[PDB]
From Swiss-Prot, chain A:
Protein name: Fanconi anemia group I protein homolog
Domain note: The C-terminal 30 residues are probably required for function in DNA repair.
Gene name for this UniProt entry: Fanci
Annotated source species: Mus musculus (Mouse)
Sequence positions bearing Phosphothreonine: T222, T579
Disulfide bonds: none
From Swiss-Prot, chain B:
Function: Required for maintenance of chromosomal stability. Promotes accurate and efficient pairing of homologs during meiosis. Involved in the repair of DNA double-strand breaks, both by homologous recombination and single-strand annealing. The FANCI-FANCD2 complex binds and scans double-stranded DNA (dsDNA) for DNA damage; this complex stalls at DNA junctions between double-stranded DNA and single-stranded DNA. May participate in S phase and G2 phase checkpoint activation upon DNA damage.
Processing after translation: Deubiquitinated by USP1 as cells enter G2/M, or once DNA repair is completed. Monoubiquitination requires the joint intervention of the FANC core complex, including FANCA, FANCB, FANCC, FANCE, FANCF, FANCG, and FANCM, and proteins involved in cell cycle checkpoints and DNA repair, including RPA1, ATR, CHEK1 and BRCA1, and is mediated by FANCL/PHF9. Monoubiquitination prevents DNA release from the FANCI-FANCD2 complex.
Family: Belongs to the Fanconi anemia protein FANCD2 family.
Protein name in UniProt: Fanconi anemia group D2 protein homolog
Transmembrane stretches, start-end: none
Subunit structure: Homodimer; cannot be ubiquitinated and does not bind DNA. Part of a FANCI-FANCD2 heterodimeric complex that binds and scans dsDNA for DNA damage. Interacts directly with FANCE and FANCI. Interacts with USP1 and MEN1. The ubiquitinated form specifically interacts with BRCA1 and BLM. Both the nonubiquitinated and the monoubiquitinated forms interact with BRCA2; this interaction is mediated by phosphorylated FANCG and the complex also includes XCCR3. The ubiquitinated form specifically interacts with MTMR15/FAN1 (via UBZ-type zinc finger), leading to recruit MTMR15/FAN1 to sites of DNA damage.
Region (Interaction with FANCE): 1-237
Residue window of the full protein shown: 43 to 363 of 1450
Gene: Fancd2
Phosphoserine sites (modified residues): S168
Region (Interaction with BRCA2): 194-277
Disruption phenotype: Mice display delayed pre- and postnatal development, defects in germ-cell development, and increase incidence of microphthalmia and tumors of epithelial cell origin.
Locations listed in the record: Nucleus
């Protein structure tokens, strides 16, 4: 209690100093309990058995008590500083004393598997650091391999963290790789949902990088072709086939979960894309599986008004109605994979049909109104009735499907004045059901199926100016004005959902670099339009962005304030500070406020002045 | 060019001699529509399914021509010619029969220069099939193959059962594998592996735990840790207090010394450490 409290008051103090220049002039900088304890660890190398006993204990104590809590379920600095110190003690003491290494590791892992209510994310860091130090030591640890066995009872979030941090160990031990693959495989047959949901995550992460991870063959990989004893030897015809036919086995294995619960299906639609963009020989098998999945929900008969069969996505068992399959996510996945297929992969009748379906689905979705869905005044969407909840899901799939085809038709043609009206009509349908759901009350936030990349590109194309005479078709979207702040409101939702969680919905949803890039493109577009209602929305997004980049992408603050500027060459990198960049951005906003105040307009906008 | 040869090259798949790979002109699925369409449009549909299989079987009579059909094709990879055909439904049941026909010849054969064991590569084709047309029969064949298989091979054949057999047949397996366990203490390890990943009756499982714990004396010391792990992971629901009590009496009243008692207690410690359902049931 004494040590713990001294750590907190030591941080609270050195926090107060940075609080005021008044204190900095009077008080010479003080040595803090932090760097003292970290010295005790450094002086422990001299064989103090009595000290390390208490160190590890104190290490976890800080991590236990001051670790994240409220972050999972909905002065946090002195919490962070205590927890950082806590993890440093344990990490640092691990690098020093050999024989307590396995001891620490047993205790770090033990919290990882056993807690499950409270966020374990900060221990997974320590764990990931312990391995990043000297993986050869832990390569053989059975305590790390045992964990794979309880990997089925662990919440999907912990499994991921466990698999990410454990990869540096999967690049050494074949046995650990096989022992993982075996465990993942029998999870596919487990009763509990969360076990199969983990197994999909493992196999989706496996296929992601095979070219990297599986360059050296495992015992499961070699065996797909029937070779048990091959080691140290590669004659590639049967090595390259052992790799490919094994991957295929994984894909055939993933496929049968597409017949399972909606939750797993969606988890699969998100993975299949990142697997397509890395391992590129799986393209035709992925495209295959998606096209076989869509062909179930697609009505081939031209002039059959609901082109997708919506009532099929809802299962009925014992007065309980669940959504099975996200026909709208099925589309999104196909939409992005098809895009990669056409843009890339040109070094045949498969991706040709999928494109034709999407357009058929576009045209018939557009001209079918409400009698074909059987909704509104007819079906009243009451959530207490089986009839109402099954309807609610339809209204939702219809909105998601409209969002996808809207995002798909934009990629089809930039220059056709014809297809923009389809984009508009696809929006008009979406807003038809978005109106119907709110008028009905209801219980729309993260619902947007638009990839961040598109929202960036869409926005850039709407506000762009510089419109050449052939590009006038854009005026179909630009003059709408509802589609105008639908587009903006999506970005505003994504940037807002970027603060809540750390992720985004669509492809490249969680990719600290890819997210950061779009933030740049979305910000420099909003920043122009604000300095050209929308202006207020542009400011609101502009502000949400800045505060994100600072509390997430903080190390990149430099390159970010570069992206908003223009170029700047070379010798300037030595000439341009973060204080240089920052001030220049400040001068522009403090200008538009000054101009907000100086103007005589009867009413000065309070909302604008506040977030300005 | 026989019925088999000509109808394949019509459907886009051109057969290639030697250790090269059979070449697929169109998408692996598009070839699957074509080969079905060819077989339905032929003047005698009913009999041609036998005609196509026969050509397949005779072309297959070459050991090298066989290992080409079991291995990936050529266009960005697709699967093997045999797997492709295994997909087609009308063609599936007759071809599954064939595969098991050719298996015995390679059963006791060792691995060749390449290291490819023909016996295991044949069965590997059945892995993760979209749908099994004749299910009841695929199981019987598999079981009768497991019965006669070499003791090195038969350990990998039982372990694959969940992958080979569909969800519908897991019941038949239970009564089968069970009887195999009473006749073999050497099959304990792989059998328990499968028994974890199938769909089973609580009443049936309980019958396993008994036959496992009673014959636990004739199990190798290497397999004690692997076997105790099955016993403690079947405890998730509440049979827990019952299982543990039995597990205790069998540990009580009934290098080698160390590594055994050490690795067995590593499984039993981590058991009660992680899962409270256990520790409290032992208390």
């Amino acid at each position: 209690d004494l040590l713990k409290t001294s750590v907190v008051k030591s941080f609270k103090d050195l926090q107060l100093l940075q609080g005021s220049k008044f204190l900095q002039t009077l008080v010479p900088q003080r040595t803090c309990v932090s760097t003292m304890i970290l010295e005790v660890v450094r002086n422990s190398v001299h064989s103090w058995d009595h000290v390390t006993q208490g160190l590890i204990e104190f290490g976890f104590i800080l991590m236990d008590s001051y670790g994240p809590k409220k972050i999972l379920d909905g002065s946090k600095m002195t919490n962070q500083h205590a927890c950082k110190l806590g993890a440093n003690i344990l990490l640092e003491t691990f690098k020093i004393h050999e024989m307590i290494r396995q001891e620490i590791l047993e205790q770090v892992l033990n919290r990882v598997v056993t807690r499950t209510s409270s966020p374990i994310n900060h221990f997974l860091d320590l764990f990931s650091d312990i391995i990043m130090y000297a993986p050869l030591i832990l390569q053989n640890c059975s305590k790390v391999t045992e964990t794979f066995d309880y990997l089925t009872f662990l919440p999907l979030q912990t499994v991921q963290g466990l698999l990410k941090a454990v990869q540096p160990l999967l690049k050494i031990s074949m046995s650990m790789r096989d022992s993982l693959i075996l465990v993942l495989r029998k999870a596919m047959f487990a009763s509990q949902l969360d076990a199969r949901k983990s197994a999909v995550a493992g196999f989706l992460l496996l296929l992601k990088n095979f070219k990297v991870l599986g360059s050296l063959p495992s015992s499961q990989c070699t065996q797909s072709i029937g070779v048990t004893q091959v080691r140290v030897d590669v004659h590639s015809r049967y090595s390259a086939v052992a790799n490919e036919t094994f991957c295929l086995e994984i894909i055939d294995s993933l496929k049968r979960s597409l017949g399972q619960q909606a939750d797993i299906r969606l988890m699969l639609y998100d993975g299949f894309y990142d697997v397509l963009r890395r391992n590129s020989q799986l393209a035709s098998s992925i495209m295959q599986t998606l096209f076989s999945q869509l062909k179930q929900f697609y009505e081939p008969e031209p002039d059959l008004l609901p082109p997708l069969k919506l009532g099929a996505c809802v299962l009925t068992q014992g007065s309980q109605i669940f959504l099975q399959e996200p026909l709208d996510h099925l589309l999104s996945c196909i939409q992005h994979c098809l895009a990669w297929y056409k843009s890339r992969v040109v070094p045949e009748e498969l991706y040709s049909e999928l494109d034709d379906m999407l357009e058929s689905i576009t045209v018939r979705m557009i001209k079918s109104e409400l009698e074909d869905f059987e909704l509104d005044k007819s079906a009243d969407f009451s959530q207490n009735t089986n009839v109402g909840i099954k309807n609610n899901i339809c209204a939702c799939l219809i909105m998601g499907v409209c969002e996808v085809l809207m995002e798909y038709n934009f990629s089809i043609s930039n220059f056709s004045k014809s297809k923009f009206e389809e984009i508009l009509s696809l929006f008009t349908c979406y807003k038809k059901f978005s109106d119907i759901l709110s008028e009905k009350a209801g219980k729309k936030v993260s619902d947007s199926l638009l990839s961040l990349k598109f929202v960036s590109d869409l926005l850039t194309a709407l506000f762009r100016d510089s419109i050449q005479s052939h590009e006038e078709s854009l005026s179909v979207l630009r003059s709408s004005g509802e589609f105008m702040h639908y587009a903006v409101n999506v970005t505003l939702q994504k940037i807002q959902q970027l603060i809540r969680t750390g992720h985004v919905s669509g492809p490249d949803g969680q990719n600290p670099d890819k997210i950061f890039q779009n933030l740049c493109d979305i910000t420099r577009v909003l920043l122009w339009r604000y300095t050209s209602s929308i202006s207020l929305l542009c400011l609101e997004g502009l502000q949400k962005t800045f505060s994100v980049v600072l509390q997430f992408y903080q190390p990149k603050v430099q390159q970010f304030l570069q992206a908003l500027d223009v170029m700047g060459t070379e010798e300037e990198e030595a000439g341009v500070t973060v204080t240089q960049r920052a001030s220049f951005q400040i001068r522009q906003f403090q200008r538009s406020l000054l101009n907000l105040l100086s103007s005589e307009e009867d009413d000065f906008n309070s909302k604008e002045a506040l977030l300005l | 060019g026989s019925v088999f040869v000509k109808l394949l090259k019509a459907s886009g798949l051109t057969l290639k001699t030697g250790e090269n790979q059979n070449q697929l002109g169109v998408d692996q699925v598009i070839f699957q529509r074509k080969l079905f369409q060819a077989l339905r449009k032929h003047p005698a549909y009913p009999k041609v399914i036998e005609e196509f299989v026969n050509g397949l079987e005779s072309y297959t009579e070459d050991s090298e021509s066989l290992r080409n059909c079991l291995l990936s094709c050529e266009r960005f990879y697709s699967k093997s010619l045999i797997k492709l055909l295994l997909g087609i439904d009308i063609l599936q049941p007759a071809i599954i029969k064939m595969l098991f026909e050719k298996v015995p010849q390679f059963l006791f054969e060792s691995e060749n220069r390449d290291g490819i064991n023909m016996a295991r590569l044949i069965i590997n084709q059945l892995k993760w099939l979209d749908r099994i047309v004749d299910g009841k029969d695929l199981t019987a064949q598999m079981m009768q193959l497991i019965s006669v298989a070499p003791v090195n091979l038969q350990h990998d054949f039982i372990t694959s059962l969940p992958e080979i057999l569909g969800d519908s047949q897991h019941a038949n397996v239970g009564k089968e594998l069970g009887e195999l366990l009473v006749q073999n203490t050497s099959l304990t390890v792989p059998i328990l592996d499968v028994f974890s990943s199938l769909r089973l009756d609580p009443n049936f499982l309980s019958k396993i735990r008994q036959l496992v714990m009673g014959k636990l004396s004739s199990v190798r010391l290497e397999d004690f840790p692997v076997i105790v792990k099955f016993l403690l992971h079947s405890v998730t629901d509440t049979t827990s207090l019952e299982v543990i009590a039995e597990l205790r009496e069998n540990l009580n009243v009934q290098n080698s010394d160390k590594d055994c008692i050490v690795l067995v207690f590593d499984v039993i410690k981590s058991a009660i450490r992680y899962e409270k359902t256990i520790s409290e049931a032992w208390f």
